[PDB]
Amino acid sequence: ELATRAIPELTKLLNDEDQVVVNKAAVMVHQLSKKEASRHAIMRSPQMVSAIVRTMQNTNDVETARCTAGTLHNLSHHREGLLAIFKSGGIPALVKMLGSPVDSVLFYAITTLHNLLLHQEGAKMAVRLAGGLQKMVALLNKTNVKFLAITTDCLQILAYGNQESKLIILASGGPQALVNIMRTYTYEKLLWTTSRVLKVLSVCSSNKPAIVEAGGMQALGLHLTDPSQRLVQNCLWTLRNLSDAATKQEGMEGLLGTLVQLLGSDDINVVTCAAGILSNLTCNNYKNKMMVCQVGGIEALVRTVLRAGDREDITEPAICALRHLTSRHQEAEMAQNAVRLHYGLPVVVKLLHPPSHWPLIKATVGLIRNLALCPANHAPLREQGAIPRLVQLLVRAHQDTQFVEGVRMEEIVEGCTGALHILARDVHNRIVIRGLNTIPLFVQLLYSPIENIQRVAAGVLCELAQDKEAAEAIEAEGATAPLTELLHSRNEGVATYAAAVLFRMSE
């Protein structure tokens, strides 16, 4: 046990006022930290560790700083050494050394801090408290990509499930620098570790705009075709989180093209994510809607729904995307036809039936409603058996409302009746709708407090009332009084159809 008088005396030498003495101690201690036997003897001596920590941060001798930092680094490979570093106030010192202009000292500091963050308890809160986050974010402008990979992983460990840390990164200009890493470098580890930080940051809603405004959507989209599976996946997850706040963000065309390509991926998780992002990005943005249509997005989304089967995780976002693409833009009509031309109508109608759950059904009804606007879809939708199921769904939804799975039954009623309203433009469809004994139900919907349900219920009744016999059955059901009431609505749409039904009942 040579450490009986070797360690204590060496501790004193490090504590000496003469720099040259301290320097000689530092180099020796540093060598002692390279062997299991002698390194253990340093770990068992807090006084020694304290001396190293103090020297490292206080010294103006670069070799000493290097040797003291390297010693701590060597200790950090073991449980005992990590705990020794922790308890001797190593972390604040290590954080301080992140300002070092010496690369070796800086690299020892980050590596040691990384090890502490990975393996030592209390290390995260200690680093946070010592102002580590600000430091680490300011270091993201360094050019060594291996250094950046370690730094970004430290941030990930700090930020994960910690609002304090996330907000500090946001405050310190973290998104800007992180997004810059993703647009500049090609080192896979760095891109990977950076993506996981941006993912953590992308979770909270208030945090998303900073990543978006910096150009994060495009920077993330840049790596979607990269060989790395883990990189692509993290980019996709982040993009999907962000895409809720990037619905009005401009310049998304390149990304959208790639997302449509990704729908043809062998990896189902890739397809699911791509569909989800496309769903988000196409919502209330005509440029995004148009772009997706131009690159054959309809075919891809139809084929995705077909390929998905009863996987509602995939069909729901795919159907939603299609619903977005079939309304309120220049190529909505092209899109409505495309769904038919690419053999979508069979599967779209199929999804109305069980075992589909309400969120999907709601989206599917909305899509069918849009598809019905195209006259060429009237007969195919009928021939696929859309009318009976639409009625059946309307009936079940009406019973409750005379939230299920997070879906209002009022929205199902409105959506089903709205679809039937559009379908009832076709004479053959009107025959089917009448044949299902829908007149009494539609008249009851005139009593609804919701104006949109009143409009579509009167709307469908209007269409049906074209036939004289149907008009008699509507009058016979006692629609006149509700209609007369609805004639005075401030909602012009409701009042228009109310007047129309009364008129057709009178001729």
Binding site: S104, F107, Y108, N115, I150
Partner: peptide, 12 residues
């Protein structure tokens, strides 16, 4: 630079 390389090999 070997500081970083050796660390990378430990962690990942």
């Amino acid at each position: 630079e070997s500081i970083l390389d050796e660390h990378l090999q430990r962690v990942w």
